[PDB]
RNA sequence: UCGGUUUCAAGCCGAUGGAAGUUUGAGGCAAUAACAGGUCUGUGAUGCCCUUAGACGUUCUGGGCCGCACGCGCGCUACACUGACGGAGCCAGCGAGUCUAACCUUGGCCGAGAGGUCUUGGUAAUCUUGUGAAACUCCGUCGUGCUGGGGAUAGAGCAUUGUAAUUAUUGCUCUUCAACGAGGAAUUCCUAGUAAGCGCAAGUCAUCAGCUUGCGUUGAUUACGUCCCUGCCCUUUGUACACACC
């Protein structure tokens, strides 16, 4: 797994070797002892098997000598590193560690920038390791996907966390001083929450996607004040959405309502008086 | 200016500026330990 | 203690034998202790 | 008052009285025994007691034993409990009675989680 | 059983010892209801009071309120020994008492207040308790 | 044994008979070639830092290991009416148990209970013990109402183990009755006396489980298929990219 204290411990030379090798795997499948040393750009074998000795006792690189064919092979800590290192010439985060968010294809943890603003990183781990291409491959493009929808929610308004950056597999975003629907015991405003939470659904049909899974542990509550009571809705659901075009939108939308209203049913008694929103009007609304 | 420093100057690689408001009050228990004054004033916002 | 390799872990303190459960494995067939089934 | 009597008729009530008037915990304490090394204490205790300025407090006695239930003896006393680090002056009410030492002598500081800022620099640096 | 009708007589929503009782469940969890007095201790009150429990709340006198209020104020002279009673062998007073629905609040504060005045550990864990969960 | 199948060759598969016929089903034993894996309180004028006011040695108190916005996980108890409560029926197996000590304990008295007290059998296929276990059976109360489901949290008392129970060891009595109306993305385990439900015993054990390992009690649904994914292989084949050209 991820343990980002050792990322200190490297020099200029260790990441300039470990760069060589993401340039040199992304090339040719295993790279061998001569490529990096020729690719690295570097001087002799002091730098180069100093700092890949450095990568491999700190398990970010795998020495493969298959009969004579010796060669290497980056590790999931390598690419993170790769990523927090072209993140911290970025000037995007400086500090990390606390892990809220243990997700399937997805690792949350707490960090920090510069100026001392907490954020989030979202890091993507497919099959978590039997290293091939198609793991990190798809990973990369994981977090490729989730951020430009992250950024196209953020665009237009939607309650949903400001995408800042991301570095490959890895995403940091905006930290949220906000409640889930399962810690939130009840509101002042119940009936404007969910006024809120229908209008968006009707809104993000307009957009044309339906975030098929829109259930209690989605919806985060941010409070703003404490003397007033300020809410805000934000919402954690990419590569479950689903365009407005797929054969089963239907049921994934009534679905997403047909649990708003039954939470809202449930833990805090308000049932809504109008009529759900149905697929139709939707499918006409964009 | 190194008196305005909380920790030592290497701000460019190390941990961030850690801010320690201290909320002190006085608890009139006669004689009484750091720790049981610690535990008597505590207020959050 | 283990009455055997100075170890404090791995006490099989029952029937007051005391010998951890590496050393006791080993002197198992010395006690008695055969392998069955 | 403890179990309805005046606080002088307590106070001056010995330790067997009080053991008659004590609730199971007590009895079962001291039916079981005490140790030597309390006897000198309890004299060190009353020693402060009757070297005291009138009208004020008595001198302080320094004490280790959190396990020792208050006793009306020692009704009045000020006493700076050890918490395992540092001493407690605590003068002994008639309120006190029956209970531990310790429990007037907390053992920790409190676990103030509610500071975000000092959490968002206590972080593992990465550089 | 027996059927056996009534016309009228019964009450839906009656009151005893200034709380609430409602009058179509058994007196038993009708009596429960009230704080200081739980399944238990309604049921050996009513065993003591001679009054049918088998018959509902609906089908209760004023005059077995009238014995049930007495035996609320006097649990050690109808026989209910001072095992079966919340707050016995009281340090202030040395007495046993069954506390009511309105003064076992009352007598919480005086508790949580005693361990608070004597600043025991209990007293300052439980109000930096409420103190910081609270804000 | 009979019949399919196979060069009709070693075998496979179905049926029948059989205590038992997937190899009736589980695991220990080698030689082999790979190990900087653990320590021996093994040894040799062997290379290190010093050499000793260092506490790596002792002790003595009292605090810790639980401290709580939370993340993660194994679980225990639950959301009831194939159910809870109150009455009666009453059926196991695997164990364990005391000496120069106090272990497993019948029975008789006291006590609401927890427990106490006076005795006793057994060093045990002989006594505890038929471990009269629970789920379960039957006869009643409740009636779908967070209810009499659930028993969190909290109050006061009473006892036990322990030198010592406060941050509450545990047990018992009364009271408080929080959340939880079959649970999202997801995921674990299982083919017959097996899953599941149920308790008991033994290890830790002075007090305890919700820990573990066995045990018996009650006892289903669904396959007896496939390579869909998960892997594990073993073939065939092209080839190091034999580091081909950009
Ligand atoms: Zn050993």
Known sequence: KLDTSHMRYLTTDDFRVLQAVEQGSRSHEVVPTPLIHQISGMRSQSGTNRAISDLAKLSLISKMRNVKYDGYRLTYNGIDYLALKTMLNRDT????????????????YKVSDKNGNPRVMKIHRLGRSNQGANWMHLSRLAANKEYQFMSMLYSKGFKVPEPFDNSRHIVVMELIEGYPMRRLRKHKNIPKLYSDLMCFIVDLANSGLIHCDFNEFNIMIKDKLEDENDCGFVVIDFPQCISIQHQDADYYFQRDVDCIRRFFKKKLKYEPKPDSSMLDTEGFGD | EYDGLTTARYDDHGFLPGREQTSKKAAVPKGTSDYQAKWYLDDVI | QCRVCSSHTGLIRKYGLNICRQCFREKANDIGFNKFR | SYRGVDLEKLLEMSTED???????????????????????????????????????????????????????????????????????????????????????????????????GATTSRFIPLK | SLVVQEQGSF?????????????????????????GVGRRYSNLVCKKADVDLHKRAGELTQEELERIVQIMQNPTHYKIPAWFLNRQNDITDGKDYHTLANNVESKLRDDLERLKKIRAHRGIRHFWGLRVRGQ
């Open chain 1, 93 to 108: 985060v400086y500090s990390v560690g606390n892990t809220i968010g243990v997700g399937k294809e997805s690792d949350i």
């Open chain 5, 11 to 35: 009450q839906h929503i009656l009151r005893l010892l200034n709380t609430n009782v409602d009058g179509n469940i058994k007196i038993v969890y009708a009596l429960t209801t009230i704080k």
């Open chain 4, 18 to 116: 009080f053991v008659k008037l004590a609730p199971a915990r007590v009895r079962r304490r001291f039916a079981r025994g005490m140790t030597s090394k309390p006897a000198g204490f309890m004299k060190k205790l009353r020693a402060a007691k009757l070297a005291a300025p009138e009208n004020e407090k008595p001198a302080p006695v320094r004490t280790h034993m959190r396990n020792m239930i208050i006793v009306p003896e020692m009704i009045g006393s000020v006493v700076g409990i050890y918490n395992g680090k540092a001493f407690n002056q605590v003068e002994i009410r008639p309120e006190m009675l029956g209970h531990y030492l310790g429990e007037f002598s907390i053992t920790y500081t409190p676990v103030r989680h509610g500071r975000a």
